[PDB]
């Protein structure tokens, strides 16, 4: 059908307030993880994570506007505005019906819900903000962005935990391929660092508790890994039909050539040991892209630093790629960023596109002692300049919900 290319990108991450600042940090192997300052966690088993430092919402919205919206929505609008600016696209009466939005979130407005809950229990239902529902529901990034830029195309929001940003980009690409849109702003945002978030993941024993060295906590495939690090932020891409992009002389970063999905149908928080669902998902993406496994050069892994997850992903890549599994480079940027949950797939799509632009595999930092069977090129410690024609981005979410995107040099 129609070809889909990336013409714009935007991001808020624990490493930077835009794409170039974040990417510089990635190629330098810098950690974005620090003790959390914005709340007292002295009573929690995990007291660190990946915060956006120095976010100024006034750069994007008025203070009245902003004060109605949970931070996840603010982060999502920031990444979305950056990406549209970056594309150089001009929204007119001639194209506004052909431009949609698919910005998702894993948990949404947990901070707002928590603060309205306080008011409700202390002071009863009349203390709840009139803006509580519209400022908290996950689809209000899509809603607010469409209103602010006059975007009248397909308008929706995915919520698939770690897979959110990957689903959001894949399904936006489907809309453009199908003819439902010529442009889509797609990605995700997350800000789940509130009591209920840290407490909730902590009560599941899902989080690293390495409070003494937060920068060493996220260590994907390392034998001393002890759970993921919770991080905040946002990613947005401008996806565009190829002839549309060429016609306005847009700068094309890369092509989005494949999108795959699968379900494990195994467990809610644990993968099959052999990562069978992840293998089906990657194969589905490669088949959608018309690619053979041997054509893959770089994988931006799910690699969240969990005991069961990290090794299941190695098993899946070995199953899919056979002997080529030792030729390709695979890295987890979560070594540096931690796990941005609903934003993870968006920021990792951007890192996959920039790997193609800069011909460099970002490192897996903290990979001091690779665990049994973790004997691939995991780009340990330092970035590796190398040939990259094809980059995959994997997301394996709670519920066993899997998604894989395939990018290619244009």
Ligand X SMILES: CC[C@H](NC(=O)c1cc[nH]n1)C(=O)O
Residues that bind ligand X (CB under 6 A): 264, 269-271, 275, 277-278, 302, 306, 308-309, 312-313, 316, 396-398, 400
- Whether the CB-CB separation of 185 and 238 falls below 8 Å is answered with yes
Of 405, 399, 391, 397, nearest in space to 105 by CA: 397
Q: CB nearer to ligand X: give 155 or 211.
A: 155
From the list ligand X, a second copy, none, pick the one residue 308 interacts with, judged by a Cβ distance below 5 to 8 Å according to partner type: ligand X
Residue number, 177 or 388, with CB nearest to a second copy: 177
Q: Which listed range, 167-175, 294-302, 320-328, 382-390, lies at the site for a second copy (CB under 8 A)?
A: 167-175
Residue 86: CB minimum distance to a second copy, A: 21
302 contact choice in ligand X, a second copy, none (CB below 5 to 8 Å, kind-dependent):
ligand X
In this structure, are residues 113 and 136 in contact, taking their beta carbons and an 8 Å threshold?
A: yes
By beta-carbon proximity to ligand X, the closer residue of 19 and 328 is 328
Looking only at the bridges linking them, the beta strands covering 390-397 and 298-300 are parallel
Which of 93, 90, 94 is closest to 8 using CA atoms? 90
118 contributes a contact to a second copy by CB under 8 A: yes
User: Per CB under 8 A, which of residues 243..272 are in contact with a second copy?
Assistant: 261-269
Q: Which is nearer to a second copy, 101 or 360 (CB)?
A: 101
Residues 381-410 that bind a second copy (CB under 8 A): 397-402
285, 260 Cβ separation under 8 angstroms: yes
**Residue 144 interacting with a second copy (CB under 8 A):** yes
Site string for a second copy, 16-55 (x = CB under 8 A): ---------------------------xx-----------
Q: Which one among 22, 31, 146, 208 touches a second copy, defined by CB under 8 A? A: 146
Interface residue with a second copy, options 51, 82, 111, 163 (CB under 8 A): 163
In 3D, which of 252, 242, 288 has the Cα closest to residue 406? 288
Q: Is 220 helix (H, G, I), strand (E, B) or coil?
A: coil
CA–CA gap between residue 379 and residue 383 (Å, rounded)? 7
Taking alpha carbons only, the member of 107, 39, 119, 97 closest to residue 73 is 107
Polymer length in residues for the chain: 410
Q: Which of residues 274-303 bind a second copy (CB under 8 A)?
A: 277, 280, 284
Q: Which range, of 137-145, 299-307, 331-339, 349-357, touches a second copy by CB under 8 A? A: 137-145
Cβ at position 26, least distance to ligand X in Å: 21
Could you tell me the smallest distance in angstroms from the CB atom of residue 259 to ligand X? 17
Angle between helices 276-289 and 307-321 (to 10 degrees): 40
For residues 289 and 177, the answer to whether their CB atoms sit within 8 Å is: no
Secondary structure of residue 322 in the 3-state scheme: helix
186 binds, among ligand X, a second copy, none (CB under 5 to 8 A by kind): none
- 322 burial class (0-12, 13-18, 19+ CB within 10 angstroms)? exposed
- The binding track of 71-100 with respect to a second copy, each residue x by CB under 8 A or -, is -------------------------xx--x
Determine the Cα–Cα distance for residues 278 and 330; give it in Å rounded to an integer: 15
Residue 10: contacted member of ligand X, a second copy, none (CB under 5 to 8 Å, by partner type): none
Indicate which of a second copy, ligand X, none lies near residue 306 (CB less than 5 to 8 Å, by partner kind).
ligand X
Binding partner of 316, given a second copy, ligand X, none, CB within 5-8 angstroms per partner class = ligand X
List the single partner that 363 binds among ligand X, a second copy, none, CB under 5 to 8 Å by kind: none
3-class secondary structure, 156: strand
DSSP 8-state secondary structure symbol assigned to residue 371: P
Spatial CA neighbour of 305 closest among 397, 173, 217, 243: 217
Of residues 51, 197, 202, 41, the one with CA closest to residue 110 = 197
């Amino acid at each position: 059908r129609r070809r889909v290319v990336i013409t714009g990108m935007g991001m808020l991450s624990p490493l930077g307030l835009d794409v170039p600042s974040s990417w510089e940090g990635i190629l330098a192997g810098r950690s974005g993880i620090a003790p959390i300052e914005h709340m007292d966690l002295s009573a929690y088993s995990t007291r660190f994570g990946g915060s956006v430092k120095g976010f100024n919402v006034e750069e994007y919205l008025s203070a009245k506007e902003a004060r109605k919206l949970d931070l996840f929505i603010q982060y999502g609008l920031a990444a979305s505005f950056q990406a549209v600016r970056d594309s150089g696209l001009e929204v007119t009466d001639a194209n506004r019906e052909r431009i949609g939005v698919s910005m998702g979130s894993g948990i949404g407005g947990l901070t707002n819900i928590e603060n309205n809950c306080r008011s409700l229990f202390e002071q009863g239902p009349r203390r709840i903000s009139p803006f509580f529902v519209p400022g908290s529901i996950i689809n209000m990034v899509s809603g607010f962005l469409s209103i602010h830029l006059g975007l009248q195309g397909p308008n929706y929001a995915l919520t698939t935990a770690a897979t959110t940003g990957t689903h959001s980009i894949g399904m936006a690409a489907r809309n453009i391929a199908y003819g439902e849109a010529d442009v889509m702003v797609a990605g995700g945002s997350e800000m789940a660092a509130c009591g209920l978030g840290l407490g909730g993941f902590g009560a599941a024993r899902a989080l690293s508790t390495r409070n003494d060295e937060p920068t060493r906590a996220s260590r994907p495939w390392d034998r001393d890994r002890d759970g993921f690090v919770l991080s905040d932020g946002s990613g947005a891409l401008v996806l565009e039909e190829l002839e549309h992009a060429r016609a306005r002389g847009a700068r094309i970063y890369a092509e989005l050539v494949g999108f795959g999905m699968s379900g494990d149908a195994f467990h809610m928080t644990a993968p099959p040991e052999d990562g069978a669902g992840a293998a089906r998902c990657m194969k589905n993406a490669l088949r959608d892209a018309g690619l053979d496994p041997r054509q893959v050069d770089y994988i931006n892994a799910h690699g969240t630093s969990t005991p069961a997850g990290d090794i299941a992903e190695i098993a899946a890549v070995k199953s899919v790629f056979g002997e080529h599994a030792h030729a390709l480079s695979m890295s987890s940027t979560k070594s540096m960023t931690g796990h941005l949950l609903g934003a993870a797939g968006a920021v990792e799509a951007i890192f996959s596109v920039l790997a193609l632009r800069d011909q460099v595999a970002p490192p897996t930092i903290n990979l001091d002692n690779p665990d049994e069977g973790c004997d691939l090129d995991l780009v340990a410690h330092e970035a590796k300049p190398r040939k990259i024609d094809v980059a995959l981005s994997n997301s394996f979410g709670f519920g066993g919900t899997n998604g894989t995107l395939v990018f290619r040099r244009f």
